[PDB]
Paper text:
The HIV-1 Env is a trimer of gp120-gp41 heterodimers that are heavily shielded from the host immune systems by N-linked glycosylation and further protected from neutralization by conformational masking and considerable sequence variability. A glycosylated region near the base of the third variable loop (V3) of HIV-1 Env forms a supersite of vulnerability that is targeted by antibodies originating from diverse germline genes in multiple HIV-1 infected individuals. Here, we determine structures of antibodies in complex with HIV-1 Envelope for all observed members and ancestral states of the broadly neutralizing HIV-1 V3-glycan targeting DH270 antibody clonal B cell lineage. Here we used cryo-EM to visualize the interactions of a complete inferred DH270 clonal tree with the co-evolving virus Env.
We previously determined structures for the DH270 UCA and the mature DH270.6 Fabs bound to the CH848 d949 Env trimer with V1 loop glycans at positions 133 and 138 removed. In the UCA-bound structure the V1 loop interacts with the antibody, the V3 GDIK motif and adjacent V3 residues, while in the DH270.6-bound Env the V1 loop was displaced from this position such that it no longer interacts with the V3 GDIK motif. Consistent with previous observations, the UCA displayed only binding to the d949 construct with I5 binding the d949 and the d836 constructs. The DH270 clone demonstrates that these epitope sites are engaged early in the clonal development with the DH270 UCA already in an orientation that embraces the N332-glycan, with the next step in the development being the acquisition of the VH G57R mutation to engage the V3 GDIK motif.
Residue numbers in the entry:
A (entry chain J), B (entry chain B): 512 to 547, 569 to 664
C (entry chain I): 32 to 140, 149 to 150, 153 to 185, 185a, 185b, 186 to 309, 312 to 323, 323c, ...
D (entry chain A): 196 to 248
E (entry chain E): 136 to 140, 149 to 150, 153 to 185, 185a, 185b, 186 to 195
Write the structure that this text describes.
Amino acid sequence: AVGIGAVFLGFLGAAGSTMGAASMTLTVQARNLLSGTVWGIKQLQARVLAVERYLRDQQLLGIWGCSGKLICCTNVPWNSSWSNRNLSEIWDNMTWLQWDKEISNYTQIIYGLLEESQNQQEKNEQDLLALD
Amino acid sequence: AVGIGAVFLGFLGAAGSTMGAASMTLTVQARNLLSGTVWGIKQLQARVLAVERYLRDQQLLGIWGCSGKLICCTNVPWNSSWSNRNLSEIWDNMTWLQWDKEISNYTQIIYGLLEESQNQQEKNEQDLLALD
Amino acid sequence: ENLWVTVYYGVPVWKEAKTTLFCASDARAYEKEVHNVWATHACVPTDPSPQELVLGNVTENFNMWKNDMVDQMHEDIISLWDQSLKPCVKLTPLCVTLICSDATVKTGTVEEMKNCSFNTTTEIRDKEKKEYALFYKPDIVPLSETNNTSEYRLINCNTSACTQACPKVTFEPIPIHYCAPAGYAILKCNDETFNGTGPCSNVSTVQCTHGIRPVVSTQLLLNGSLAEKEIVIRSENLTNNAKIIIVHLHTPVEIVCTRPNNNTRKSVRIGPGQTFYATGDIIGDIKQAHCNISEEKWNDTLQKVGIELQKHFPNKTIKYNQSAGGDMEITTHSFNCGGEFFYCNTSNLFNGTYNGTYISTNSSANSTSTITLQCRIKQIINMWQGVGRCMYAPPIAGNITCRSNITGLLLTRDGGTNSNETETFRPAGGDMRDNWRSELYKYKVVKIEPLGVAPTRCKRRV
Amino acid sequence: CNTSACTQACPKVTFEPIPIHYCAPAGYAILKCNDETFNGTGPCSNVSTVQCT
Amino acid sequence: VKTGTVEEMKNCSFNTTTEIRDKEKKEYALFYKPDIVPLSETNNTSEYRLIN
Ligand SMILES: *[C@@H]1O[C@H](CO)[C@@H](O[C@@H]2O[C@H](CO)[C@@H](O)[C@H](O)[C@H]2NC(C)=O)[C@H](O)[C@H]1NC(C)=O
Ligand SMILES: *[C@@H]1O[C@H](CO)[C@@H](O[C@@H]2O[C@H](CO)[C@@H](O)[C@H](O)[C@H]2NC(C)=O)[C@H](O)[C@H]1NC(C)=O
């Protein structure tokens, strides 16, 4: 269960569990992204490591209008055409791997819409604050 | 004194002073973390530089629930067993070096508690916002 | 009712993909000041922690043959071997016309060596003196078509040059832990009854792999891993007979080999500050190197493997036959011990049959019974192709013992004909990829996609 | 020929000693003991910070 | 050449070391004139050297 207290679930101890239980303890997965020491050119080549992919993720998350490496609720409507499935069957008895397998075909459009939604909201807020 | 105006205190000009005076002008210490140019394999090996430790610090600070490279007040209670010392003797006439020397033995527990406190608060706020 | 998007960072997702791995080794190698293997020079200190965490409920597909980790390991080993020989003396002024005669030691005579004398340049750039050395016959080739039996040449200068390995560096196999870089994870199939291709119902996650012995062998596998429960057979496909069948063992089989000749080394200095070692006189009675295996244990293992193989071929009995033959390096069991390369013959070992009638060996009438094999020795070695294959192994004084264990075998189907009731199997070696693939079947490498999306009954506060 | 081989230095390269400033990388600092009566081992009551030596 | 003669090439013969480190045999080859230079001031027309 998740009520261990002092978390020592390892790198991927929560994988394969329910979404609700696996929703917590997400910090350990993100934190463990650094290791290694020098040997030769190839080691330093690989030592770019997550420094590039982590920056990619940070750019994508910040552009969408989210601060902090945690959950972030947006305002984009969920078009039912993508899934058209019951809420209970997804959020209670389904793991992340098969969900990603099912929803792997609709990634570009949602990211594109989220990219401009944050900019629109920021400009509207700037205009509202500048009006006074 | 700290009332110089245009700050030119160097990299570590404020070290050894009181906590109150040294509390300000913390930006210069963090900003100066980049230098160097290429010569050989070892130079590029060292050119990882603060890019790894800075990312470590950013991960640790963001996980705790703090945005911006400045002060950040948390809600964890201060158990007196660690120090059990007067407030005046620490915040007025003590420097950071000896304070760190004294309090170097209680670093893991506080970080561990701060890691989960932010997640708990975030989940509670998410539930509160989702209830409506 | 209405649901809205939400983004999650750190969601565990696995995607199989290619990447590079690091090597780590125990700190005992770092204790040596210099000239201690290559792990201390090329790998990091390791740590058993963390333990192999087991996941609650997971499902995955494992493939053994369609993997690139073995190729990466082979490339790394090849690069390390090529780099290690750069500073050592490369010889070259030694392929002059050698005048060779029959070896006649004070204690008798030996047929496997020849007493070759030749001129060598002294410390002076232009000045020559005569020198002598004993050389093994396989490293000696007639010079030209002119049948002058007094002239000979090394088996070289027709393919490529040669280089002598340093004496202070040893070839002992030190275990290497292959660890993955950050951003990737290593998944381990915990099932001990895994056939080699298919899913595993118990998959764990590991930081770094266990010890891996970089050993070299063709027919059999030397000391290494052991099976957990019982013998398991792994093969790419039984439809094609050309594929190599790897057979594991539930218990090891002891093997001990030796060379009591008690050779001694000479010291010939050629060029500025570099010497070439060679075998000189021999003190003591002349004897033959040999290898020793236990008979009852080998027969029991063979019967166990036979009954395990009967499931795939229930309509046919089992028989074993001598290897194909040909070149010495192909059909002979070639291995290394203490810097000396041994080539053994397995003709006396793979000779038997089994028709499903189990025979108990619990009588133990003579526990001292054993099977003996005769072996040859070579100095010039062509380990691989197009890597600067030629290498010279210097001799070692005294006589050595090479006690070790056997835990695996390599077999190959024979071409069936006439619907024979007794289709056989033959030993057959090949590249080191087959040897290294038997110890990396459990591990797979995956990449993490921490970003994900999901709907929920929440909205952003304005 | 009794110890090792030899090599001739190029003629166009000189052995004149040019001063070299040893500087520290970012994330590290160089502390300098300003006391001129320092014995070699012990504390200094006047310590400065320097970019490069 | 068997078919005639050519002015842009010369038939140079020289000793070369065989697979044996110390053993020489004669060999021949045709070389273009620009890659051929007289050896020394001594006007011996039978001796030549590469332009190297
Ligand atoms: C192999 O032959 C060489 C000669 O080609 C032997 O070396 C000579 O041995 C005789 C008798 O011991 C000495 O008088 C000579 O001075 C030796 N010659 C040199 C150059 O040292 C050599 O002993 C033979 N090998 C063995 C094992 O006897
Ligand atoms: C050289 O050969 C001899 C005879 O084969 C070896 O003799 C014994 O080797 C065992 C190996 O464990 C030792 O325990 C014994 O003490 C040796 N002596 C006797 C009388 O049995 C000898 O070991 C070989 N040399 C080396 C270095 O192993």
